[PDB]
Homo-oligomer: 115 residues x 4
């Protein structure tokens, strides 16, 4: 709801389906604590990661497990994963979409923050 | 329905709203004939450009009027527009989404072809 | 020298070698007139397209023949080509590098403008 | 030499100058150990991080301090940094160029691997 992830495949021109995504939140001791996770759907989307109540201001890391995705397709990839690290703020749009476009040796990511 | 366009703004982290989009189809004499057009919605999307009946195999050009978009925001851009040129084929997924991510001096585009 | 093109392959993580590039300039009658052409080298670069003297103010189109590139690698890509359209030298002479990163269903392009 | 970083600014169409870059290598205990650091030059490039001798096989993280870059330009960006994580030299020595293209709410990264 307040945090959605969408993953696209630039080789096949398709959603990136069944990609593991792990979200972490930075703790007071500066370590990454697990926050939410899932696998992208047939549409390349992962919804329901968190709720407005739980998604408080803080520093979050979204890890997209790109290496396993490419290995499953038989394509040798460069990255171990794609990592998106950002601060969530309450004076900004209410909904965060993290979009990632994947190629074997490249990835691009953007944030769409609305409301 | 068979052809959708989605445009995102990498400076603001938002949909690119009210961007003019012109679609052309290559004619027998190799000229670009107007096919469909519109402006992106509040979600950065342009739906209803064509129908399955009209969207036959052929070469299509999607022109996204990025220069006017940036000028309206007071940002000096590099490109006159972004152009996406592709062949539509019936042996491929039925729905075409042309996605574009815009910055003043760069743009990225991908095709998501499903069904 | 004043206009250089660099092309990278996001599947292999390599320069995109032997990519054909055609440059056009918009004429007074609003047609695209041939201006220069060449092919990328082993480093993915194309130098020597023009000179400061010939590269006058105007609207230029750099067409990168991505479809032929992918087909030769056994990939049936989405786009016919990547086109980069821009006004050049309207504030006086500048040096332009057009960079493109290629995937079968996506491309990204940026400009580096100096002087 | 074996590891170079190039950073471009998609808003200004320029090299991204004075960007801090920190490189880490995963140690036997699974922690990220400092490996090398530096700042991009006037050309957006960072050379001399390491040598063929010191750049042994391993998992490396290249952290590009994009937030500090944008803040100094008066832009409040989305990401804390851009992180590029990859296994290096597991098939023998190679030369790695990590390229990043930066916008306030987006970044793209690619790798060029030679030898
Ligand atoms: O829901 C969304 O926000 C959404 C975003 C999309 N684009 N993400 C991209 C697209 C291109 C690049 N690139 O080539 O740098 C990076 C990220 C596409 C669709 I379809 C979407 O539905
Ligand atoms: O030396 C290099 O490897 C080199 C790479 C360059 N592009 N990196 C990109 C370009 C586009 C995207 N994107 O928007 O997906 C991601 C990374 C440009 C120049 I000029 C270079 O000299």
């Amino acid at each position: 709801c307040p945090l959605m992830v969408k993953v696209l495949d630039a080789v096949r021109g398709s959603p990136a389906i069944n990609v593991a995504v792990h979200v972490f939140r930075k703790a007071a001791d500066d370590t990454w604590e697990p926050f939410a996770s899932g696998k992208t759907s047939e549409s390349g989307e992962l919804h329901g990661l968190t709720t407005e109540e739980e998604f408080v201001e803080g520093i979050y890391k979204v890890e997209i497990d790109t290496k396993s995705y490419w290995k499953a397709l038989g394509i040798s990839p460069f990255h171990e994963h794609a990592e998106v690290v950002f601060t969530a703020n309450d004076s900004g749009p209410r909904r965060y979409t993290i979009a990632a476009l994947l190629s074997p040796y490249s990835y691009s990511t953007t944030a769409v923050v609305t409301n």
